[PDB]
Design a protein around this nucleic acid. Structure first.
Ligand SMILES: [Zn+2]
Lengths: 76, 49, 85, 199, 62
RNA sequence: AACGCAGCGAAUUGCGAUAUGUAUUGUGAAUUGCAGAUUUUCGUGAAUCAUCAAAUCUUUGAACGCACAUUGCGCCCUCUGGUAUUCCAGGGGGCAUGCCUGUUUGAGCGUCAUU
RNA sequence: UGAAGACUGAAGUGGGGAAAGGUUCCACGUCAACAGCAGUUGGACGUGGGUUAGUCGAUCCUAAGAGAUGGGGAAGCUCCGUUUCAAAGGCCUAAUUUUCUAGGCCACCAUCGAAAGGGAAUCCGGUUAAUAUUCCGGAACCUGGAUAUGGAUUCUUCACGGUAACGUAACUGAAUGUGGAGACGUCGGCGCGAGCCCUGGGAGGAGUUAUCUUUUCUUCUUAACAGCUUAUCACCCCGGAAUUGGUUUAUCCGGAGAGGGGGUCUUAUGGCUGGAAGAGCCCAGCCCUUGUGCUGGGUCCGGUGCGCCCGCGACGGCCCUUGAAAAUCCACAGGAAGGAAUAGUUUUCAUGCCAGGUCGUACUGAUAACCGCAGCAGGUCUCCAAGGUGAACAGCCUCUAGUUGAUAGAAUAAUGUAGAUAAGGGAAGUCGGCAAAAUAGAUCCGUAACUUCGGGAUAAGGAUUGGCUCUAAGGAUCGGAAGUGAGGCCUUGGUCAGACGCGGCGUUGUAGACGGCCUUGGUGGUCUCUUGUAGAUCUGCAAUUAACGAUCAACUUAGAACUGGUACGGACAAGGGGAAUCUGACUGUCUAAUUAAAACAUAGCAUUGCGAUGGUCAGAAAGUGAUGUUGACGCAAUGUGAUUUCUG
RNA sequence: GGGUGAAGCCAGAGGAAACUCUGGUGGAGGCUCGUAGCGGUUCUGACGUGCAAAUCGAUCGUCGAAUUUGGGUAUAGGGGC
RNA sequence: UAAAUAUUGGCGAGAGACCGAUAGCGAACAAGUACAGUGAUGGAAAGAUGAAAAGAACUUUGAAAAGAGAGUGAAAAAGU
């Protein structure tokens, strides 16, 4: 698998070879500065499966809503 | 011997099927002098090739 | 240890199966059979062994062409078919 | 491998094509890598250069000499050996030549010869010591080594062999007019015993 | 502690049949058959290795 | 010579993916160890019958495209699929060597006539 | 099946393969024979079930070799020969746009031969009574076909950058020629990394507990593949070296340009992110006839080394030994031909589409699946390999894993077989010290004739070794006491976002913790006091060498005291020594199953034949062979048998 | 796994000089003690209608090369080696 | 260039002062078969219940095999 970037992620969705995209939640704790959430947006199709790391939960929620209604957002 | 040929495996395929005892309904046939199979093979006693 | 210890080392094959004669007597190092003489033109027959011919010569096999020749000769090698009365 | 002589590989051009042909020469003591070599009739007299015997003065030194013209080499190819030119003839193109054994020979004037002594000299001087050194010499040549003495053998296996004591029995000096099987010893000997000085 | 086995039948330790032992995500120690190393490209006139060119066995860089 | 084929067979006896046989002709009711039919039983017809003139004939072998301790690897014509003169697969037909008779292209100041 | 005792002891009674066997693997039924006792058990007997590949092999290339064809032999079965005294072909582009014809270049040549050599590309987790790198789930990669979107390139064009080593995501190139990879021995130490071993703190579970032990044991793991970083060796620019410098364990290098300062490159190997925590392992708790789940938790942070074993790297010894070939893929020289702007070139790059045949794949690999007439103390090619003792892959004792199989019971006569000990003497035995005894490890002392001065040599011959408590020496990392303006914690002032949770049927109401940036002062010794405490935990003006301080960490080598039934390499393991004579110099080799030697071989020495139309030798014959991919410092044929010394 | 310590290098001491001694470093050899491996000396031990048509035990030789061994290939009976 | 002449092989018919299952072909039977050897090759043993299987239903002892009775048949002194 490759990675992210951001951006390019937005241009990868414009292909529509990439149809679906699962999301994952992984609780981390950078030396207990903050015990933070993180999310992971993975994009299948075809040779590679790409993935973007986003740490802030706020930044993730704006991005999660902004994608098309027709796009199949899988979870876990 | 694991890495065997097709010509060898074809001979051993026969050796499986031929090695079996005499069917009972043949013994009730008319005239018939046969009782047990003479041509029989066990792997420990006798070898093939 | 010329006897039983040397017998323990025997696990090779000087001879394999043959195409023509169907017998485990095909020398690989020489590229020739001892029984029939494949691959040559002829069958390896010898007058000094009468039993050698008796085991393999005509009559032993199916004779799936030669078996019906005497029947064809007697009738006179016909063509066509019988009609009816 | 198994040759007392370091070889040399020289690149010549093809006069009739855009190509290169390598030829394997025996290196005379004096050559080096990144050196020019001049082969022909009009070529000059230096170490390495290949000349025909006619365009060479008397008392010169050469090696890899041809018996005929077009033989591609024959006389004097071994280590530390060299042919010396003695004489000349105008009528009949035939120079006089001395071979390294001692016996002289008349060779044609147009035959070739590479100038200089053959490299790797003084190979025979060191003794072999241990038998394993002798093994490795014959290991990269033939199967001619561990030679048993014929007198030690049985009378079946060799003529000299047999008897209660290890002796030959009859004269080891055997004739030229003999047959294969008999010839084991000194064949057609003029002299026998220890020779003094002059060969 | 944890012994290992061969994979591709060929039992004899020759070149093109050597093993680097590796820990798995399961936990067991298992073998993996290491490929042969590629020597560097070299100069024509001199016998010096050529700089600014990749290694790779002759077929990998097709 | 190998490998297969019977409703239930391992061998022997028969036959070749049309496989203990199909068509054709004759005889006129069986086969049979146990099943099972088919009703064909005043018939263009039972049968492990006799007969035998039409066909089928796996892979081989003098064995023939080149090989053959390999079910190895190619080339040509032709129809059908996948977008196809060239790539992939499928169905069909072909490609050995020596020698003879002829046919068509040719090679040689070997040699003849004509510009 | 349970419980208790045992052994093999990781060079194994462990886990997998090669040759060879061929269903012996696995389930259900069942004991007439076979398993030299027995049998309810079985590798037996009866009836079925079982081996799934583009990536692992075979297939393909060549090796020592084998072997058609053209030719020449032989009455002939066939023999020689493989590039030859042969007219020995198959590879690319158009023409023509019926798909058949035209361009061309180039040329001593079948075919078989390796399941350990060469070689296009796959890994983790799950699942079966018996199969898996081959099925299922998830993530990759190659070769051969097709092909269009984006990007790049183009007014003078087939890109620009850097002094240079070289760089960038891409960046026309035929005939022909040249170069690289494929492609290569061994012994030695030094360095780097993997895995295991060892060990500290925590987070769980099991063991022990009359008494003692912040402990005895175990779990805390991370694949191929994608991306960005990291190196000894080489190499480029600057500059000019004897008071010669730099430098390895190992002495090599420099006006053919060293040291010093600054760079470029191969990515072997590590690090971080993706893979990927959703998986696996380890606890705790719910139901549930079954099938099963379902629900919480945790999966963390380090240290050490002449350690063991494997790989990689730069170096150094060896040789009258210098340690395979071809298929196959790439690069450069070279300029053939072909191309634009109202548009065209590129498919050595980014994405995207289709396809991947044939055969092998079970199990055993041996004191019971192979060979030895057999379930025979025999024989038969390999890989992985823990703890303690110790020089040690020696012997002895454990852990993991695997067996507990080899007819049993009762008494203890002679004679046996295998092990043992013995008063005084010490080879008197016997053909003969045969057999058995004694010596043995380490450290220090001490060492003859003779000698080819290399050895003899562990010569001979003495002394010491335990346990416990101490002392001495041997290393690696990091730090200098004072003179302002500027960037940790706390506070002051400015400046900017804003986490989550809950309630009515995606919506609508709703509290709302906290984070960094910017910048002035204060913060071990000291005093105020009966006593202090927090962090010494960014530039200026410029003091110093042994006179030192902190912090962590190995195992070696010396010396001293005390102490015992004078014992201490306490078991295991481990040379008897000396003075001569005959003989072969030495290491080496042979009579497989009565002879291992003084026999054979050997280096060294000597003799004989040969200049290719030749010597020695094969063949029935050949337009045929071996030495010979040879040429007298060579090839062939014999004798003697190192050195010193002589050969009448 | 030990023992011995050859060339090649570095430093010192003695001497009027020619040179001569001493200490390290280094790791040579068909060297040497000994495990697996390969062999088969003695007990004229065990067994000798055997476990075995050549095995069993203890004691022994050699153990980095004239070494030990797998697969492929060559040489065939007055012939081969 | 037919005929009179040959013939231990092949296809089809006749006979015998010949052998009678250790004989006669090696082989009267699933014989060039089973089995041995790396290989050329080597190479056995084995015929007969009764006219008809009518091949022993049923009881009882035994874990079973079998045993005692019974029954079939001219005979089980014919029980595969
Ligand atoms: Zn044959």
């Amino acid at each position: 698998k490759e990675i992210a970037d951001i951006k390019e992620f937005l241009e990868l969705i414009r292909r529509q070879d990439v149809n679906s995209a699962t999301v994952k939640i992984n609780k981390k704790l950078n030396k207990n500065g903050k015990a933070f959430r993180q999310t992971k947006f993975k994009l299948r199709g075809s040779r590679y499966l790409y993935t973007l790391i986003v740490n802030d939960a706020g930044k993730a929620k704006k991005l999660l809503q902004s994608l098309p209604p027709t796009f199949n957002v899988n979870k876990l | 011997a694991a890495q065997k040929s097709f010509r060898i495996k074809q001979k051993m395929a026969k050796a499986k099927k031929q090695n079996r005892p005499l069917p009972q309904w043949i013994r009730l046939r008319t005239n018939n002098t046969i009782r047990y199979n003479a041509k029989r093979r066990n792997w420990r006693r006798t070898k093939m090739n | 240890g010329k006897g039983t210890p040397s017998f323990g080392k025997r696990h090779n094959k000087s001879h394999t199966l043959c195409k023509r004669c169907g017998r485990s007597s095909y020398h690989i190092q020489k590229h020739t059979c001892s029984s029939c003489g494949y691959p040559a033109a002829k069958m390896r027959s010898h007058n000094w062994a009468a039993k050698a011919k008796r085991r393999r010569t005509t009559g032993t096999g199916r004779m799936r062409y030669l078996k019906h020749v005497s029947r064809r000769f007697k009738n006179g090698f016909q063509s066509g078919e019988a009609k009816a009365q | 491998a198994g040759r007392g002589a370091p070889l040399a590989k020289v690149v010549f051009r093809d006069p009739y094509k855009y190509k290169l042909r390598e030829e394997t020469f025996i290196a005379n003591e004096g050559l080096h890598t990144g050196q020019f070599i001049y082969a022909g009739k009009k070529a000059s007299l230096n170490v390495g250069n290949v000349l025909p015997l006619g365009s060479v003065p008397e008392g010169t030194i050469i090696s890899n000499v041809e018996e005929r013209p077009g033989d591609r080499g024959a006389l004097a190819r071994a280590s530390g050996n060299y042919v010396i030119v003695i004489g000349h003839n105008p009528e009949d193109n035939k120079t006089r030549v001395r071979l390294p054994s001692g016996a002289k020979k008349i060779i044609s004037s147009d035959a070739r010869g590479v100038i200089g002594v053959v490299a790797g000299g003084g190979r025979i001087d060191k003794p072999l010591l241990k038998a394993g050194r002798a093994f490795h010499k014959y290991r990269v040549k033939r199967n001619s080594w561990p030679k048993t003495r014929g007198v030690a053998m049985n009378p079946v296996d060799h003529p000299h062999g047999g008897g209660n004591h290890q002796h030959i029995g009859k004269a080891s000096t055997i004739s030229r007019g003999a047959v294969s099987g008999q010839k084991a010893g000194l064949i057609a000997a003029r002299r026998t015993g220890l020779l003094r000085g002059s060969q | 502690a944890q012994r290992v086995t061969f994979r591709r039948r060929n039992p004899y330790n020759t070149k093109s049949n050597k093993i680097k032992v590796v820990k798995t995500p399961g936990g067991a120690l298992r073998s993996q058959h290491v490929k042969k190393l590629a020597t560097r490209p070299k100069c024509g006139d001199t016998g010096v290795p050529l700089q600014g060119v990749s290694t790779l066995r002759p077929r990998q860089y097709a």
